[PDB]
């Protein structure tokens with residue numbers, strides 16, 4: 144069995160290997176990359192996402208989200224308070240202000256220490272989940288707006304034609320902006336490209352051990368767990384590495400820098416934080432190996448998780464027994 148300790152693997156494809164996206168994902172899996180839940184892909188030196196980022200300041204962040212924490216430093220939830228619209232240039236200036244800017248630090252480890260010590264005492268503003276793309280249309284390799292769609296994959300594997308679309312999302316971050324512990328919708332893959340700015344630190348639980356994280360989460364968030372049998376779908380709970388280690392939960396960590404891709408694999412729980420002003424692009428995708436994960440994915444039916452249009456068909460076809468309850472949660 145390849146990668147039996149479930150380490151995060153880092154790949155350096157050549158420009159030739161960068162042509163065929165599906166083939167390279169399958170390659171990475173042949174080497175055991177999926178066992179970690181997360182892999183890093185460093186693009187060949189010849190590749191670029193676009194020519195420059197000099198002209199992005201007029202993108203609008205219609206609903207910036209202030210991420211307000213409750214709990215203790217290592218075990219907390221966050222809720223998202225909506226803020227007034229602002230442009231990317233206005234948000235960058237805000238991220239760089241004395242109130243929000245990254246503190247002086249020695250290295251990524253010192254910054255990570257400071258994040259876990261101090262995150263809860265601040266409320267950073269995240270421009271998350273913005274439909275759009277920063278890939279140039281002429282970028283033909285690993286262009287996250289030109290991937291094969293999940294609907295087409297389901298149709299190719301299973302023969303059933305379904306409605307829905309699959310487009311990327313932009314994320315504008317600042318120091319301490321946080322992504323809570325989650326797997327993707329329908330336990331899909333994700334791919335995330337850090338276009339510019341400061342790094343993003345990731346934490347991940349191997350898919351084979353995801354239920355250990357869920358059991359810890361039920362213990363640590365007992366009211367939330369009574370409310371919903373899949374409350375991590377709400378994407379609000381944080382647990383620090385120190386707490387994970389104290390509870391024996393297997394995990395790994397890595398820091399993504401600008402110019403690098405990360406892939407999350409089906410049922411790979413992940414969480415993390417931004418180091419400072421940055422911009423990432425991410426999209427969900429599927430492969431043949433995903434189908435079995437999609438069929439088994441948990442679902443929130445309490446009403447909190449509220450998701451895209453396109454998830455309807457995935458539930459309806461892959462999980463017909465759960466469909467009626469899940470759809471009630473949506474309505």
Ligand SMILES: O=C(O)CNC(=O)C(=O)O
Nearest residue numbers: 314322333334335423425
């Ligand atoms: O970058 C973020 O805030 C969150 N991204 C992801 O969870 C992902 O790419 O799967």
Ligand SMILES: [Mg+2]
Nearest residue numbers: 199200201202
């Ligand atoms: Mg612009």
Ligand code: NI
Nearest residue numbers: 326327333407
């Ligand atoms: Ni994710």
Ligand SMILES: [Zn+2]
Nearest residue numbers: 371443445447
């Ligand atoms: Zn729920």
